[PDB]
Write a protein that binds this ligand. Structure first.
Ligand SMILES: [Ca+2]
Ligand SMILES: [Ca+2]
Ligand code: NA
Ligand code: NA
Ligand code: NA
Lengths: 241, 242
DNA sequence: GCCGGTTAACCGGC
DNA sequence: GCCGGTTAACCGGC
């Protein structure tokens, strides 16, 4: 992680800060690691602007130089072909990542999770367990085991008067967690869910092993969900029909 | 529907309306034209508890709904209900409804569906298929077949300069649709999905028939999803762990 | 045309 | 502690 080494710095600047979008972690990152930091759409704009000679989606999709990163970051074919310096990508809540840090052809996908710590703790959607499954599949098929990390920054806040105030933060790395410990909440858009501060970081094996261990986990949890569907959505309603 | 009789009015008033870059506008209109019938869901709960100050605790307060199904559809949780006070009112919350219209103890649950008419069409979450199943089961168990409607108001809008502007609307009633034709998107929080504009409205049966028919549909779709998951989420990935 | 996956967290049961 | 269902619409593949 490019962020981990300066976590103490970030934590100190965020705590006590106030919003009247605490995802102004971007501001700090952009101002301290200006060459590395992009919002996802910015990175895509940047990428395409720097290759004016490349037109149409097929060619622009080659710019990624990576099937896995293509899958994680790129917009759709029509959006890509229609892109121009006069028609730039804008932010979208559907984008995989909030912030991208990129250096030496290595990518850190950062996802900020904001959290009102005044309320009963509710583990947020982290990422589609299905998207992550495809990601691991693609990592394996293309042997891309040293290309990117997916990391999370929890920003805790509470209402104090007229404004929300940050009171703490946490940071963790998806690929340092034990895959079998990942909670997959099928109803909630098949999303993995955890609080960043609770994420175990004790995985010892390789990235490839992580990917293989995750796929086994995912496949296993899918089977369990299908079974659970009978018990929760079928059996209790049989009697009315 | 309490809205239906003035929908022509509603449709005309809303078209041309702008919001700075619409549900609130729908509410304002209903308030002005049906002031006595119109509430935000939290507003209705607040009103109910305000007129029963001697009724404290969640149990006693739950008894005020006088309906298992409505309790299920409208109430807040136990702690929230017990902690309610005049100084600690409910505010907007995954509440079932956007707006309630109630008259003579009949309830219309209204959900506004806003829609960017400029983008590729994408049918939005309408309501949880599972919440709906539970609802149907409670209607049956309690024989509450003439108590409430669940209705939808689509508000189409496009970006025009610095403003969002409404260009058209549509209205439809859930319980007038054919239950077996409702699309359950399991991945999408198990939500029924449709565009209000597209919802068929020719259902021929009683409310109880609707409920039973929906339950059959729900149970069938759940069984098929269970199987589909192996096909979609297991098979394609088994090769990496064989 | 047809089809269904994803982002944002967020409440409250026992 | 442990567990998981709901609201907001929204995008792009053949
Ligand atoms: Ca985020
Ligand atoms: Ca709504
Ligand atoms: Na995410
Ligand atoms: Na709502
Ligand atoms: Na809804």
């Amino acid at each position: 992680s490019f962020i981990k080494p300066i976590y103490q710095d970030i934590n100190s600047i965020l705590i006590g800060q106030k919003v009247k979008f605490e995802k102004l972690v971007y501001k700090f990152l952009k101002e301290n690691l200006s060459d590395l930091t992009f919002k996802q759409y910015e990175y895509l704009n940047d990428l395409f602007m720097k290759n004016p000679a490349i037109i149409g989606h097929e060619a622009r999709y080659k710019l990624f130089n990576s099937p896995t990163l293509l899958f994680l970051l790129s917009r759709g074919k029509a959006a890509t072909e229609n892109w121009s310096i006069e028609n730039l990508f804008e932010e979208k809540q559907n984008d995989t990542a909030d912030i991208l840090l990129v250096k030496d052809q290595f990518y850190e996908l950062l996802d900020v999770k904001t959290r009102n710590i005044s309320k009963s703790a509710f583990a947020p959607n982290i990422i589609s367990a299905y998207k992550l499954a495809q990601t691991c599949a693609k990592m394996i098929d293309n042997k891309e085991f040293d290309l990117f990390d997916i990391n999370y920054l929890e920003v805790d806040w509470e209402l104090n008067g007229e404004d929300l105030v940050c009171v703490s933060t946490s940071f963790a790395e998806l690929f340092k967690s034990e895959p079998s410990e990942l909670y997959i909440n099928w109803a909630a858009a098949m999303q993995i869910q955890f609080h960043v501060r609770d994420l175990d970081q004790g995985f010892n094996g390789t990235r490839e092993e992580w990917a293989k261990s995750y796929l086994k986990h995912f496949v296993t949890q899918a089977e369990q969900r299908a079974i659970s569907m009978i018990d929760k959505f079928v059996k209790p309603f049989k009697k009315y029909i």
